[PDB]
Amino acid sequence: KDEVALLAAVTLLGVLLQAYFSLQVISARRAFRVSPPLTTGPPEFERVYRAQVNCSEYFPLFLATLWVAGIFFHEGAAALCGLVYLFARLRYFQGYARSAQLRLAPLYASARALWLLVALAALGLLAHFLPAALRAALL
Amino acid sequence: KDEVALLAAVTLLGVLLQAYFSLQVISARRAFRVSPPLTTGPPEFERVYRAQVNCSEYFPLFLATLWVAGIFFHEGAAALCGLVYLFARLRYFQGYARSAQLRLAPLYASARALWLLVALAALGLLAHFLPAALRAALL
Amino acid sequence: KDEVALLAAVTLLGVLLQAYFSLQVISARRAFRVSPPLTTGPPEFERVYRAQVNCSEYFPLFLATLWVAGIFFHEGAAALCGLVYLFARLRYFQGYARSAQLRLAPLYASARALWLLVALAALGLLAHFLPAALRAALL
């Protein structure tokens, strides 16, 4: 509980970020008059809508790495990457709300923080399994 | 294990609910003759299909809040909201299977239970971090 | 930490599998010249793209069952099913990259391993709640 509360706060902030992205896509449906179950519309509606679809798909990938890196490497370091990723996702959504070019940079900034979580999850898991394997192989 | 088994049961029930929604979308593909990878078809096929897409997107948001509220506020109270949300999602799918108007009410009933989980996650995290911050600031 | 490290490794491997599926869909966008936010294109682009959408949707369902079965039944047995599911998903993506028929078999092989995780989660939860219920009812 104590060693996972930063991971739980970054998690809740990520959920609130997804709520923001749903509020924005629901505004574009009223503005461009796009009626459900239609996902097609003007170039800008499809961009705002597509920005949300992508963020939603990446949300469990972010959660999985945040929790694994947080528990196997260091909670504060994984929660720091968790914020960097979530801020890059806000910028990605805001960029896609202007154009597809404008979303490119915050997409690579989010990919950056996501690879950082994967590296910390891998380093933490290797520091757990490897010493015991080195002992078994040498025995 | 003991303090998370209700959260794990509500989780498994949510997975079984997603299995039900996949069984229903696969029935609409045989009924309206919609062949994969096509996601377009009659107004009712797109509605059943779209109801499932939305539920799938919300599933990790539900899981994140259920587990955070369950561990930082109260397991039984978060599992109670977890059932309210899952029942509203069954009604949302059944409503969308009739029309887009008919899905509106169970969608706001699911949003209701989802905001309740977010409030309990926030209250639980504030009860953890705030006393220590009040002590540090006053020291 | 010790009793969840296999579940955390199978989790990280599932994240790396999703990274592979994104690398493949981004290759199809350059090859068939499909520009975002467009999700429509030649029959093969829509198949590679659709294979990824499905995998992404199933990822939290896999994570939920892997962790519940791993903690309530047996970590090694749930991690074994976790690998069977992830290998069937690689084959599903590779099959869909050829045709919709070719994806059918690895889709049922993934459904197989997913039902196995659900059964172990159910058996583990029943072994937890049922003895106490039998005692209460008989008392």
Ligand SMILES: CCCCCCCCCCCCO[C@@H]1O[C@H](CO)[C@@H](O[C@H]2O[C@H](CO)[C@@H](O)[C@H](O)[C@H]2O)[C@H](O)[C@H]1O
């Ligand atoms: C397969 C083998 C893997 C090879 C690994 C190669 C590692 C390269 C080592 C270079 C030196 C290490 O660099 C390490 O980076 C981390 C994360 O950015 C730093 O962390 C830093 O974050 C930011 C920079 O983004 C700063 O504002 C902050 O001052 C600091 O905390 C460490 O303070 C630094 O010591």
Ligand SMILES: CCCCCCCCCCCCO[C@@H]1O[C@H](CO)[C@@H](O[C@H]2O[C@H](CO)[C@@H](O)[C@H](O)[C@H]2O)[C@H](O)[C@H]1O
């Ligand atoms: C920023 C500050 C936040 C402000 C917070 C304002 C809180 C408002 C307080 C009103 C009184 C509290 O009301 C509290 O609600 C919960 C959840 O619905 C109740 O929980 C209830 O659930 C349902 C009602 O839906 C009943 O069938 C059941 O009898 C009861 O358990 C508590 O029994 C009640 O005490």
Ligand SMILES: CCCCCCCCCCCCO[C@@H]1O[C@H](CO)[C@@H](O[C@H]2O[C@H](CO)[C@@H](O)[C@H](O)[C@H]2O)[C@H](O)[C@H]1O
């Ligand atoms: C509602 C009531 C539920 C009814 C449950 C019915 C269960 C049927 C019992 C049949 C016998 C049990 O069969 C049990 O299956 C598991 C999982 O495949 C085996 O596990 C096996 O996996 C693979 C086979 O896929 C083998 O390579 C390996 O040798 C072995 O570990 C057990 O070694 C076996 O004992």
Ligand SMILES: O=C1CCCC2(CCN(c3cc(OCC(F)(F)F)ncn3)CC2)N1c1ccc(F)c(F)c1
């Ligand atoms: O579950 C549903 C179903 C219907 C759709 C919504 C309901 C209306 N939404 C908002 C967003 C918002 O933004 C505040 C911010 F951005 F600060 F979070 N404010 C007011 N309504 C967002 C989508 N939703 C939802 C989604 C995620 C959640 F976490 C949640 F709690 C509710």
Ligand SMILES: O=C1CCCC2(CCN(c3cc(OCC(F)(F)F)ncn3)CC2)N1c1ccc(F)c(F)c1
């Ligand atoms: O993984 C896959 C890949 C192919 C598609 C399916 C396989 C066929 N489906 C069903 C649903 C059902 O409903 C029983 C209820 F509703 F009680 F759950 N009964 C029989 N088959 C659902 C979709 N699937 C799947 C999905 C989620 C799961 F949890 C799971 F275990 C399997």
Ligand SMILES: O=C1CCCC2(CCN(c3cc(OCC(F)(F)F)ncn3)CC2)N1c1ccc(F)c(F)c1
């Ligand atoms: O977050 C984002 C945003 C932009 C898109 C990508 C960035 C480029 N991708 C790849 C994949 C790959 O495959 C190595 C394998 F397959 F071994 F994982 N190699 C090099 N780049 C995958 C999609 N991404 C991403 C997704 C999941 C991750 F886990 C991650 F770390 C990053």
Ligand SMILES: N[C@@H](CCC(=O)N[C@@H](CS)C(=O)NCC(=O)O)C(=O)O
């Ligand atoms: N994905 C939605 C989440 C919130 C929402 O309103 N969901 C459903 C409510 S039935 C919706 O309107 N989806 C759009 C559609 O059905 O095409 C968004 O980003 O706005």
Ligand SMILES: N[C@@H](CCC(=O)N[C@@H](CS)C(=O)NCC(=O)O)C(=O)O
């Ligand atoms: N999203 C599916 C999940 C189950 C399923 O059959 N998935 C794939 C199997 S390749 C599918 O048919 N997806 C529809 C498509 O490919 O357009 C549903 O709700 O039916």
Ligand SMILES: N[C@@H](CCC(=O)N[C@@H](CS)C(=O)NCC(=O)O)C(=O)O
């Ligand atoms: N779903 C993507 C994930 C990686 C990616 O590039 N995501 C966004 C970057 S804005 C994308 O290009 N999505 C396709 C689109 O916007 O239509 C894939 O499988 O390639």
